Design a protein around this nucleic acid. Structure first.
Lengths: 47, 145, 58
RNA sequence: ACGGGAUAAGUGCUGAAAGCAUCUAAGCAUGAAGCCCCCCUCAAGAUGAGAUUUCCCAACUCGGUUAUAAGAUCCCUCAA
RNA sequence: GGGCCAUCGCUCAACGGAUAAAAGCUACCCCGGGGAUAACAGGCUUAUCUCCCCCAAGAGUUCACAUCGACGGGGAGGUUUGGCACCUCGAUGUCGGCUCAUCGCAUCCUGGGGCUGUAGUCGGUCCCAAGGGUUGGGCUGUUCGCCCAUUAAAGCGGUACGCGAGCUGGGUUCAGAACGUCGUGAGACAGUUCGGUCCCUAUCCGUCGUGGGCGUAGGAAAUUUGAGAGGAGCUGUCCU
RNA sequence: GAACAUGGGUGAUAAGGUCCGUGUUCGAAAGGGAAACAGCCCAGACCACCAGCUAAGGUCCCAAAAUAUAUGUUAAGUGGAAAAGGAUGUGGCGUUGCCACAACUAGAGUCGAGUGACACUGCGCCGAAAAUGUACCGGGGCUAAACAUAUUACCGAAGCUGUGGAUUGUCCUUGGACAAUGGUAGGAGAGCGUUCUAAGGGCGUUGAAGCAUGAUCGUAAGGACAUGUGGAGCGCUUAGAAGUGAGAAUGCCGGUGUGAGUAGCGAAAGACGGGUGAGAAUCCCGUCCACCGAUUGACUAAGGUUUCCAGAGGAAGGCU
RNA sequence: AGGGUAGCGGAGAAAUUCCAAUCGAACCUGGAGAUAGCUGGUUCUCUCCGAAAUAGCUUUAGGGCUAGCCUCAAGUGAUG
RNA sequence: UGACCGAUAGUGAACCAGUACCGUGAGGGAAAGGUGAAAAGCACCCCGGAAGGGGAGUGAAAUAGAACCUGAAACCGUGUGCUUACAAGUAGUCAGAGCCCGUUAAUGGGUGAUGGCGUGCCUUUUGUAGAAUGAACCGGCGAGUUACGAUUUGAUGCAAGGUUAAGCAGUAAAUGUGGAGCCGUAGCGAAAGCGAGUCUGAAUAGGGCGUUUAGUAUUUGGUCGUAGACCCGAAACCAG
């Protein structure tokens, strides 16, 4: 129930290979000079 | 340190040979093939590069063995499972898939290194049918020391 | 290494390393194994003549 | 619970050491819930990367950078 | 009175004699140490233990070789009671039962047999055979063991006497009590009987599922060959 | 103290058992062979080399060297694991005797060609059953690549030789030598560096000490010199005095890791509208809904000691 | 709520039970750097030589003392 | 005044010290120094609610901006040369292609496709890769010392002699002066005693220890004695 040995800087950086965030949809507004969320609306993004 | 020629890439040339196992005794025809595959018959042989040529058999269904080893000498195999001992094939496995018989025998006299595994991929054995490598112009070795 | 190279360049003239060496010492010849192999890889003609000298010395 | 291919203890045949006689020295047909095959599921990362039918095809100049095409996704309404 | 010289007396027999004045219990025990040294398991050994043979004496009115087996002798096994002290005392921590397994053959059931003191059903000893099976209860804690009723049968073992970072805590085995024998007494004997805290968030290998990346000499979609690997395998009754 | 080989006691001509005696090795010994294996076999490492000859053991492939020669022995994979026994196994050693003995039969006659007890053997055969997986040739494999002899050839160690160098102790009385140089507990000898003092001579804002980097020098501990950073002291030669040298004590103190974006975030039921603001699921007002209900109600005492009221906030604070 | 009993002392319908999370004798400071035949630790480099695990006595048996084996320097100086 | 310390040192305390804090009480008891020569401590403009930046300015220096002299390791990041998705690994070392470099200039340096060989370090042991002990990592600190005696060795001075103690007038000068004393020059015996000899005792006889004379004062090294005596660590005992 307790780590027998300590992890290195190579085995610790290998586990953080999938630990990341994905990019958003960024549905560019038709004509308003803003940015609306995918299938959403904003006070600046007209479309 | 001094003067000792060391063979490397783009300096060595490999050829193609064709041996026939019509009246051979497996083991005796296997040790003579391993040496050619390792390239221990050249004056420029180095133990850190892949030196040698390819060998091709055309009669793996004519191999014979003296003694009562045709009924004995069973081949075992495991599958990493509780009681996975596989010994279906014995000494009479020269009638069903005899290409593996010679393949294993010649692969059991080579080094188990990273270069010894790629040196065993230069051998093509055929039950009795002719080889389709006619565009390689293979030389007929046949005669063995 | 040298021994293995000299043994492969001595079987081409229907001879054996053990025999070749035995006859090479009976003809009174002082040569290193590193030099013999160096000659076999280079001027083959020279090596060919050497074999004949150690072949009639048996 | 079936149907094959071999076989083990037994059983005889051919036929002996050693002239007559043993199933062994060569061969032989038999021969078991055992062993291969047949039934069912997963299987080319089988780096030995297999096969079959259909669809797609470029300007630069081949440093390859720019790129689009078949297709794939991001996003949204859902459940066998 | 000391000293040299010559005698004398204890008792130091644990006999090179600690001060010639020296008994016990700790189940409430405490600190310093040791696998230099015991209890459990592993390893060596096999007296005892369980098998297999050898000679056959005796048992069958015949037939020492159906069967039984006198002494004595030769082996195998490591599953009993022991012997030795080689790993562990800056901890290898627990007997049964529950849950889940896997391997063996010295075969309980099924199967294939020669031979019977086998007519038949039946059954006795031997040979081959390890694929799958191998029940629910009553009685003390029982690893034992007897009994009840079934079943084709209710075999013998190995795997830290399998398995507690998977469970129970009845049995042992701690502080409280009662009886019995023993001791002047404090107590001991384990002889019985009643009550008594079972800790841990899984880093690495292993196993059961399920994805991302790249590889296969153009890229993509769908249907596929099968070198390999796993699963399966039991058995009863009636009409005939 | 330990194993191995011998000579005994003790125990069961049991033990990797136990106690003495005589040797060798390990202990304190690296190197080669026995597949891996402190004690078994061969042999004792001062240092350099891409030189040569040998020891035990070996020469088909893995893996250096004979698929060598001559002669026999062996059909089991014996080689490559046990015994009393058992027998129409056998190559060699001696018999014994019919000129019948294989098909004759008493529980008598032929035909055509080997028969057996016994004795010493050499190699085989049966006796031979265990629990994860072939499972003691090390593996592939071998009828010689097995066994018993003979002679050869070659391979094989840090052993010996060749060539250059270091230290000793000798020697001879200036460099050729002569020999020698594994090492634990220990004994003896010669050195390197750190802080301070004394004397002499030095360096330094034209940049000292420290710190960072480098392909440099000495037989080791070590020592110079450039270049960048730094901004005020510090070397060298001879001698003297010591708080004189760090990798381990479940050592003392400080700083930062791993486990990991993991465990946890400890009493009532909330929902929307409006407001405030750089920012609101969490602050302010409003409406509905719910909980405590002999109490999470109201008031005395003990105890704590400004936590009480208003206005302004930058964080720290409050498990968001 | 206000008082009284203190460490070999006190209290105890008696359990080695309690006396500030402390009890087969509580807490604090001092003698005190108590004693430890026991375990652990002990810091730079090279050169030459190189052991023992035995005997005797011991309130002795994992301790000590003399001899046996090592080293250094003097002597005698061939007895090995 | 000092061959004393220089911020983990020296007082527990160089600064907010017997103070934060801890206990009912007796009592226990820390951490923490440094901008520059002079505040000349960033006027002004730009982004932000602010914090903080980017220019500018002050200065010899702003990587001297109050996290303020120098700024080392552990640890955390960004860019970039060579290399990596069929592989079994005390991670090194010997040999060795290819692709990039260019020094303290030398038979140079970085990276590593493949091949051979190879079970960490300290302690304790007959023997440890050990599944026996210890340590997460890095830095700082952390264990044969001094005073007075005894014996032996090297060095120097004088030599049948050698040398002073406490004192007293002096740079706390450690050179003069200071002859109480100490060792040696003669031993033997229990002593009286005799003496190159003496005791032995009935004995001069035989024997024991002596005689053939080199020592002494200070300093250096080795070991020992009395002090805690190489360093850390107990259960417990007594006093108030």
């Amino acid at each position: 129930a307790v780590p027998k040995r300590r992890t290195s800087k190579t085995r610790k950086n290998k586990r953080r290979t999938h630990f990341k965030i994905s990019v958003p949809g960024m549905t560019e507004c038709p004509n308003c000079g803003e940015y609306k969320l995918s299938h959403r609306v904003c006070k600046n993004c007209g479309s | 340190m001094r003067q000792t020629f060391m063979a490397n890439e783009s300096n060595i040339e490999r050829k193609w040979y064709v041996i026939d196992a019509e009246g051979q005794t497996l083991g005796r025809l296997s040790s003579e093939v391993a040496s050619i595959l390792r390239g221990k018959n050249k004056v420029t042989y180095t133990p850190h590069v892949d030196t040698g040529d390819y060998v091709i058999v055309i009669n793996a269904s004519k191999i014979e063995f003296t003694g009562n080893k045709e009924t004995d000498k069973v081949y075992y195999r495991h599958s990493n499972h509780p009681g996975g001992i596989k010994s279906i094939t014995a000494g009479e496995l020269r009638r069903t898939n005899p290409e593996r018989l010679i393949e294993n025998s010649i692969k059991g006299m080579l080094p188990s290194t990273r270069l010894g595994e790629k040196q065993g991929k230069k051998l093509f054995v055929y039950g009795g049918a002719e080889h389709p490598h006619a565009a390689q112009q293979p030389e007929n070795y046949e005669l063995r020391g | 290494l040298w021994i293995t190279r000299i043994n492969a360049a001595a079987r081409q003239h229907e001879m054996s390393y053990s025999r070749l060496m035995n006859g090479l010492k009976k003809a009174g010849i002082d040569i290193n194994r590193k030099m013999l192999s160096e000659i076999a890889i280079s001027d083959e003609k020279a090596f060919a003549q050497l074999v004949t000298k150690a072949k009639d010395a048996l």
